[PDB]
Design goal:
The protein has 291 residues and is mainly alpha-helical. It has two domains: 170 residues, Peroxidase, domain 1 (Orthogonal Bundle); 121 residues, Peroxidase, domain 2. Helix content is 46%, strand content 5%. The protein contains 14 helices and five strands. The strands form two sheets. Strands 2-3-4 form a three-stranded antiparallel beta sheet. Strand 2 and strand 3 form a beta hairpin. Helix 1 packs across helix 6 and helix 10 crosses helix 12. The relative contact order is 0.18. The structure holds protoporphyrin IX containing FE. Protoporphyrin IX containing FE (HEM) binds next to helix 3, helix 8 and helix 9. Forms a one-to-one complex with cytochrome c. Keywords: Heme, Hydrogen peroxide, Iron, Metal-binding, Mitochondrion, Organic radical, Oxidoreductase, Peroxidase, Phosphoprotein, Transit peptide. It is found in: Mitochondrion matrix; Mitochondrion intermembrane space. One of its GO terms (biological process) is response to reactive oxygen species.
Length: 291
């Protein structure tokens, strides 16, 4: 499988900045979703789940084909709750019908991080919608009830090393787990719609307690009202992971710089860019535009 990126006909930077601004403006307007957390968190989980199906061995899955629009990927149990991010994006796609699906779900992920004050993420266009039969089967996204060894092994298939895995996991500071979507309940911190290095700090400074929740699943709870998944707490159990968790807890600027690189790579995995292709775009936030 070779997937060559092809720029949407005649489009350039200015066209994708209007799609970015349209997404950002609605993030600001529908601010009441999920008890005022808003849509930013579910939009970065959607961009990670449409890219997380990639397999490095035969180049199937990944964000290129925009196949989350088909029944099989959209009804995946692992994607429970992301229907809310899709529904948020469906009026922006009506307004900009020329944008491809893979491009709109990955650009919604980029827009949410930056609007929630994270790092700039360089983004490249050119994903092309592929047919229903190119949709990956269910079962390629990770389980939550597992340990460090499982996380390390799982992220090998997306070829992410340890440093890239721990940076990517810092997004678990955003939003929350929802019992009816995943069988886990609660937020991982105080500031869940602002992008910070809070996840690492909470992991190292809270007193965590192994409890059983209402869906019979075990999770790590703190007196402050925060929770960690078994797969999140794995990060301080493993020696390799623990020293990278400590580096990002002590340096937010290195964490932003490493999350930006690993998140762009996640979104671009499996796509070939021709050398006549445009350079990555860096979009201005509503704030830098005075909007
Ligand atoms: C071992 C890897 C991972 C596992 C097992 C995992 C699991 C989960 C689970 C169980 C939820 C709760 C969903 C719900 O109930 O609504 C969740 C939410 C979320 N995860 Fe992950 N995750 C993993 C990696 C990542 C990565 C790599 C990213 C992003 C780059 C990410 C971003 C998010 C975000 C932002 C949410 C919040 C969604 C919301 O508030 O609706 N996850 N994760």
């Amino acid at each position: 499988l070779v997937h060559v990126a092809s720029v949407e006909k005649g489009r350039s930077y200015e066209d994708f900045q209007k799609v970015y601004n349209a997404i950002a403006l609605k993030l600001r307007e529908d601010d009441e979703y999920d008890n005022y957390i808003g849509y930013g968190p579910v939009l970065v989980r959607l961009a990670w789940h449409i890219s997380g199906t990639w397999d490095k061995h035969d180049n199937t899955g990944g964000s290129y084909g925009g196949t989350y629009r088909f029944k099989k990927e959209f009804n995946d149990p692992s994607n429970a709750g992301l229907q809310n991010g899709f529904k948020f994006l469906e009026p922006i796609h009506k307004e900009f019908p020329w944008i491809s699906s893979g491009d709109l779900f990955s650009l919604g992920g980029v827009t949410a991080v930056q609007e929630m004050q994270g790092p700039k993420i360089p983004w490249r266009c050119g994903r092309v919608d592929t047919p229903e039969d190119t949709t990956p089967d269910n079962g390629r996204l990770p389980d939550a009830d597992k340990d460090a060894g499982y996380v390390r092994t799982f992220f090998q298939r997306l070829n992410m090393n340890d440093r890239e895995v721990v940076a990517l996991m810092g997004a678990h500071a955003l939003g929350k787990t929802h019992l009816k979507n995943s069988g886990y309940e609660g937020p991982g911190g105080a500031a869940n719609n602002v992008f910070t290095n809070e996840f690492y700090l909470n992991l190292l400074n809270e007193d965590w307690k192994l409890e059983k929740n209402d869906a019979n699943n075990e999770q790590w709870d703190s007196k402050s009202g925060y929770m960690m998944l078994p797969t999140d707490y794995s990060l301080i159990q493993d020696p390799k992971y623990l020293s990278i968790v400590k580096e990002y807890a002590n340096d937010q600027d290195k964490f932003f710089k490493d999350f930006s690189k690993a998140f762009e790579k996640l979104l671009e995995d499996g796509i070939t860019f021709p050398k006549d292709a445009p350079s990555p775009f860096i979009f201005k936030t509503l704030e830098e535009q005075g909007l």
